[PDB]
Design a protein around this ligand. Sequence first.
Ligand SMILES: NC(=O)C1=CN([C@@H]2O[C@H](COP(=O)(O)OP(=O)(O)OC[C@H]3O[C@@H](n4cnc5c(N)ncnc54)[C@H](OP(=O)(O)O)[C@@H]3O)[C@@H](O)[C@H]2O)C=CC1
Ligand code: SF4
Ligand code: SF4
Ligand code: SF4
Lengths: 287, 208, 176, 114, 80, 156
Amino acid sequence: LHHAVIPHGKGGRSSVSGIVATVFGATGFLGRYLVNHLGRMGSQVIVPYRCEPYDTMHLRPMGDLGQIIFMDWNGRDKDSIRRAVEHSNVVINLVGREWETKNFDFEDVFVKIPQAIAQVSKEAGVEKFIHISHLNADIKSSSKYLRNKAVGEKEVRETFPEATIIKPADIFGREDRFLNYFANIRSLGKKTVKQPVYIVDVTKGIINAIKDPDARGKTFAFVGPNRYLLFDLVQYVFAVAHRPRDKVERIHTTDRTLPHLPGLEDLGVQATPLELKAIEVLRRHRT
Amino acid sequence: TRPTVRPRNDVAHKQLSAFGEYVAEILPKYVQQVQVSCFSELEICIHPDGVIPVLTFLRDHSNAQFKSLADLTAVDIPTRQNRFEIVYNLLSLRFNSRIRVKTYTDELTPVESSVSVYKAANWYEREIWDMFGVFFANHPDLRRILTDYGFEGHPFRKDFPLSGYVELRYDDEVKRVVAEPVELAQEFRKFDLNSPWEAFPAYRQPPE
Amino acid sequence: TYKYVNLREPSMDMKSVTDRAAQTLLWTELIRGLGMTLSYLFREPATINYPFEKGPLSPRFRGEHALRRYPSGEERCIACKLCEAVCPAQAITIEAEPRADGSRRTTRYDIDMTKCIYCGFCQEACPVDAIVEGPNFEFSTETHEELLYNKEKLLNNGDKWEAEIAANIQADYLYR
Amino acid sequence: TSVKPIFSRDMNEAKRRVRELYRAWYREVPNTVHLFQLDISVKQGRDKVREMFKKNAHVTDPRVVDLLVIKGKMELEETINVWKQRTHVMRFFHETEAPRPKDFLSKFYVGHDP
Amino acid sequence: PLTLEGIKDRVLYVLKLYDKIDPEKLSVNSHFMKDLGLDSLDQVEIIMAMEDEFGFEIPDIDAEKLMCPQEIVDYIADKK
Amino acid sequence: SRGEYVVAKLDDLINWARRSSLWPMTFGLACCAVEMMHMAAPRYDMDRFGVVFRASPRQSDVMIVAGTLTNKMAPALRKVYDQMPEPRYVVSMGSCANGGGYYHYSYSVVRGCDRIVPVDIYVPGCPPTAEALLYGILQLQKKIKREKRLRIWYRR
Ligand SMILES: NC(=O)C1=CN([C@@H]2O[C@H](COP(=O)(O)OP(=O)(O)OC[C@H]3O[C@@H](n4cnc5c(N)ncnc54)[C@H](OP(=O)(O)O)[C@@H]3O)[C@@H](O)[C@H]2O)C=CC1
Ligand code: SF4
Ligand code: SF4
Ligand code: SF4
């Protein structure tokens, strides 16, 4: 194919790799670590932000000289999205808000956003589109959030056949939501299985899938290497931290394994457990 | 001749010639070359086993005081069995004269560490250790000054290239500033400028 | 000739010791310092209201990095590569080709405004005086992408003004 | 060929001073992983310390071994003082790849690594 | 409690406490350098483990002169 | 619509409040620090713009990075940078700091402070003239005029 797309030597810091990556969202958490691993790989990253330029200013300089690029977009029209996919080799859907707002509920982010971008991505000629989702988001009960992600999975499975539908379990890191919610509470416990997986294993798997062809169409789900009790986990978090509502239903309800579909070691990246990284990341206790 | 040519004074030339033959008379154990340039400064070229005797002599003796110390650089000349050159650069306070003690050395054998007799030599010696690698035996304090603490390579050799092997950048994966091998933005295009036709005739080395 | 300082003695006369005692117990010299500072209070301060009153300069300032061109004519450069040879941070980058005429010209002429240290060596070195250190100093740039000037940037920056540049060169072509 | 070595006379003092220096590094690492608020278990740090000792294992000359003892002593002193920082201790490790293996196949797909 | 047998038992369970050794395999002529597959690096690890557990400061030339668990037991029974 | 009217007035007021004072720190390693102390001159003021040099890194609004940023400097720089509130802005002053500059091809000199900190205002020069630097601070203030944080918060 065309020149300035072929790879060049080593990786990172204006060592040009093959991909031209359009990443949605990325002002939050997982998109930020993904932009960081692409800058470590050293590719050109198009990020659209609807938000303030100051947040992407603080998550900005991880790209090298003129590598990342900014534009503006919304969840109403198609012109800015087509402007985002004017020239893009690969593109990833990493969108979502864990609490309903005025202008957008859990409905129509997961419904309205992937329709338009999957339509214009299949039209405007991109390859290897990757869509995240949550693990075990089904038609089943107790979560408008998870049934809406099941609706979005139905649409992204139906239109644009050649995707990579992917889903991790609840992930933990430096700016995690639910682990900080565990540290910042106030409290009761049941029996509920749950596997957490550290964030860099997920993003190594994502970038390996984004540079690897001939494993596409296969949906993936990610595996915590321990998969143990919720209440033991709260005990361990309070132990390492030295101290004695749709979200709370999501964390209490269920997190199970699904042996139908492949995971980490079927892609070839080492899993890292909760305990090592939790000693690493649980700062911000007393003194 | 008379305009725009910096005139030399043969008085300092003759006096430093007499002083140089005097030094070569009175310390025959260590003297190899006593050379005088056209701009009349003395250069005494010395084996590295008489550093302490020559400096303990040249600090005193009332024919040449020379209290003041300056530049020590061990100017790296390859194509020699002994690469580096320690250059002591001594200055009088009563006499207004400058002498250059050029003593030679290699990468490994220590010189005698003049800090016992010239107190100024301490950070000069620490600098030469941190930039070149000439170890100083019987010296109190050898640490690293002018380089990073996680750094090694003795960068002012000729064998250390102009760019670095390490280069820092911040990354948020570990929330800190980490070291990566060098990935420049431009080549530093080095221009060949050793032009032929022998711009100086008096310095023609004997060929074979 | 040497003129040393701090060699007096305290005169043990009654007048000198009572003057030093008044100095101690009566805070006189501190009041003298306050008098000097209020003497500079009632002056008029030499500030300039900035965005209305720009500062003074010289006709030999080093700013914008413009290019010139011949009177009613084409570009003045030749791509003789002297400025890349003399740029002491090597920010100049010149790739040259001849066009459909036959006269020698360029393709790409780059200054890193980061690495430009504003000597004036490319002002002294250019034989046709093609590159001129521009007159004004207002760059104030948001991103790092903009600060890598191209040849078409320098041509449109020399087309933005020449009357300034021509007046300054005709003021000061006789010295340098 | 007149050579005056630094400290030793043969490799016996070399082995003596290097086993003393390894004892110092072995009992100096858990203090640093307490102080600098690191992210690394103690045995992983000790294993990479003994890895750094094993890296220079193919050196025969007494002067070079003595000079390595000098280098290691200087950096152990600068780590028992607090003169270094978390960047430097993480710079001794490798938690920022550098992932390229020694396979001829991977050095064939990634360009030009003979 | 300072008997020969309490000393040999405590040397034996700190050998069991040490991780690279395989198997337990106590002997009077064990010679854990090359009969048991270790390093002088791991020799001085074991010696400093002894020194840190219950003994004196244990100099290094004598630490080269042990090279054997029973001779370590004899060294503590020598010096303590 | 008058909700948007009152929100626009409130956002422009708070952005004007940030435009007013702008308490900097003077980090300032090499000779660009001398040019900072000469934009603190009697001729080019700072107090006309509310700018007051303040030694605390905790109450700094903007941060002028100036001088040659080196490897031996860098962890101290970002450790200064973190202990600073969530609205914070960076002026990279001078050819050394905004892209490496004259010491670009050397060990132990960071090629521009993009590798360390985010940069809001690059200003080139060696040293950039105090007149030019003050113009750079005015274009900083106009960037502060263009923020619409509260408008994006309301339509969030
Ligand atoms: N355990 C986990 O954290 C899991 C996470 N995920 C996915 O990982 C990603 C990151 O996780 P998380 O931090 O929780 O999510 P985030 O909110 O942090 O990331 C989503 C990003 O897209 C933006 N965004 C989302 N919806 C809209 C919208 N309608 N209009 C404009 N911008 C929008 C967000 O806010 P802004 O607009 O202000 O930029 C943010 O920048 C999400 O896509 C989430 O679905 C999935 C499963 C599990
Ligand atoms: S020195 Fe002048 S004529 Fe020569 S290449 Fe540079 S700008 Fe062109
Ligand atoms: S003024 Fe700038 S472009 Fe010209 S020679 Fe100097 S550094 Fe190079
Ligand atoms: S850019 Fe120029 S004035 Fe500023 S620190 Fe560097 S050399 Fe000094």
